[PDB]
Design an enzyme around this catalytic site. Structure first.
Site, PDB file in Angstrom:
ATOM      1  CG  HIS B  41      43.367 -40.265 -38.624  1.00 44.39           C
ATOM      2  ND1 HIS B  41      44.379 -39.894 -37.767  1.00 44.39           N
ATOM      3  CD2 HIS B  41      43.789 -39.942 -39.869  1.00 44.39           C
ATOM      4  CE1 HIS B  41      45.351 -39.321 -38.461  1.00 44.39           C
ATOM      5  NE2 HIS B  41      45.018 -39.341 -39.738  1.00 44.39           N
ATOM      6  N   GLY B 143      52.557 -37.672 -36.168  1.00 45.25           N
ATOM      7  CA  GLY B 143      52.235 -36.416 -35.535  1.00 45.25           C
ATOM      8  C   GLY B 143      52.022 -35.285 -36.516  1.00 45.25           C
ATOM      9  CB  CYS B 145      47.760 -36.443 -39.298  1.00 48.36           C
ATOM     10  SG  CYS B 145      48.399 -37.975 -40.014  1.00 48.36           S
TER      11      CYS B 145
END
Ligand code: RQH
Ligand code: RQH
EC number: 3.4.19.12
Lengths: 306, 306
Positions: B41, B143, B145
């Site tokens: 993503h 932030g 991930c």
């Protein structure tokens, strides 16, 4: 979202851990520039610990009696001295992994991370606080002495604790990196007992702010209080008196959430008088007091470190 | 003595964290040998996340659209591919800090350490468990991930988790390092809800053994039970059924303490039916379930890591 008991990344400290052996005793040392710091009781036998005369015991030790090993590589000891309750072993090689660092002496209520080590090798990292009675509640087995506690600000490691002793009650005592014990404790195996383990009120309040930020708000009530009224309840429950300085330190969390500090105090007062009624706050069933206001801001905003 | 929620030392993983930016999105990647792993993503806008077609979105991305930065030094991307829900970004330089490592897919109930990072920079380390509902209860902000979970055995890092998603209820979902989600979760912003958060019975029992080892023994009683009788109580309290495999895994802790596993089960049964009565176990007022039997042995014996 989410709020966890979080330690600082330990890599900068891992690079500083060595093994120190003197005669039959092995513990950990901290290698920064060309000095290795370790507890002076490395020079004692188990027998010595009952009534050690460190100056006299030290006379029998020379540089070559202090075996310092970094991984599988031996370090050459070119000098040694005692400073309070630590030894400073001067080595002929500066640690190439030395981070930017400072030595700090912390106040009760302040938190820090501990890198538990055995034989110079890191085992785990966890978060502690200096208790109001100057103990810490750690996890330390035989061989862990010389493990250190620290905080990081960006790229600078502030070392604040070196582990020395376990009291018969299972709590822990140690020194700053100048070798001065926190509180009244000594590096002798004697009858020393910890005083009252007071709860760090300003930290509980910070953690209640963290709870609100992260969705846990059942404990917010319709009440307010004053410092003096709250403290009459704090005293009954063995909480530290809350000061105006503490209120000021909570200002940013108050501003972020819109909950006045004294309103949060009134919520805490009700929790103390009524208990949790089987509910939880941030996955805990008691009031957590080992997050400082700065810890809460840091974790809730995502501050990182070089 | 003492027993703490302890994470593995994080230095070996710190050396692998990079920042990955694609268009307007920045998150973390894991750099091992000449490959950077990150959540797919990274290629989505906030708008895309409602109904992303990852294969179609990926068509518009070339190697030079993936900005990979290690500290202040840029890495050159020479290839990229999607594997399940992760991207593998081939870079022209092997990470010189690559540790010995493996990729493992863990079972619910197993614990691991998380190095929370932002912009490729480590922020903190903490201990988690894979819950029986395949979520984890972490601390992750926007932030974060691409932050990873891991275990260490001596000198080998077993990576088991990469962070991808926060559910509306504040719990966390992610993948193994092959990009397959734990549980039924997907990398889309939809109505996915977690199932029952069951308590990991074998871990609670391990932690009760840790308590006994460390001096907390008020909850030991005069009773025993059987697996089937205990499980009738486990079910009522949303505990995982205890199996013979779990009993066998507890064998070493049983042997060390001399408390038969089924006797400890009977102590746990009484705790479930009667509560704690305002008492604590290892500084907790609830039954802790994020220590495995192996965690307890490790921490109680002092195992270290290269
Ligand atoms: C004991 C304390 C912290 C109050 C103190 O006196 C302190 O000294 C230090 C002691 C140990 C270290 Cl590791 C660092 C500083 N200080 C000096 C000047 N103003 C304050
Ligand atoms: C899903 C699971 C763990 C049961 C599985 O099938 C596993 O495959 C892996 C998947 C992801 C990784 Cl990261 C590692 C292994 N496996 C292969 C052969 N026997 C077991």
């Amino acid at each position: 979202s989410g709020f966890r008991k979080m330690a600082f990344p330990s890599g900068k400290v891992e690079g500083c851990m060595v093994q120190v052996t003197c005669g039959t005793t092995t513990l950990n040392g901290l290698w920064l520039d060309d000095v290795v710091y370790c507890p002076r009781h490395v020079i004692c036998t188990s027998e010595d610990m009952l009534n050690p005369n460190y100056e006299d015991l030290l006379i029998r030790k020379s540089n070559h009696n202090f075996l310092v090993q970094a991984g599988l590589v031996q370090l050459r000891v070119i000098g040694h001295s005692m400073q309070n309750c630590v030894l400073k072993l001067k080595v002929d090689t500066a640690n190439p992994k030395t981070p930017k660092y400072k030595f700090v002496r912390i106040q009760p209520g302040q938190t820090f991370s501990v890198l538990a080590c055995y034989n110079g090798s890191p085992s785990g990292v966890y978060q502690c606080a200096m208790r109001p009675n100057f103990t810490i509640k750690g996890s330390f087995l035989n061989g862990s002495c010389g493990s250190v506690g620290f905080n990081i600000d960006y790229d600078c490691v502030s070392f604040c604790y070196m582990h020395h002793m376990e009291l018969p009650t299972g709590v822990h005592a140690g020194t700053d990196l100048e070798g001065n014990f926190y509180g009244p404790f000594v590096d002798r195996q004697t009858a020393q007992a910890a005083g009252t383990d007071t709860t760090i009120t300003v930290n509980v309040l910070a953690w209640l702010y963290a709870a609100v930020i992260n969705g846990d708000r059942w404990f917010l009530n319709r009440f307010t209080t004053t410092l003096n009224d709250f403290n009459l309840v704090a005293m009954k429950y063995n909480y530290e008196p809350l000061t105006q300085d503490h209120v000021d330190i909570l200002g940013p969390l108050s501003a972020q959430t819109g909950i006045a500090v004294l309103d949060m105090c009134a919520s805490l007062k009700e929790l103390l008088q009524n208990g949790m009624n089987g509910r939880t706050i941030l996955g805990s069933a008691l009031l957590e007091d080992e997050f400082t206001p700065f810890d809460v801001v840091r974790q809730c905003s995502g501050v990182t470190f070089q």
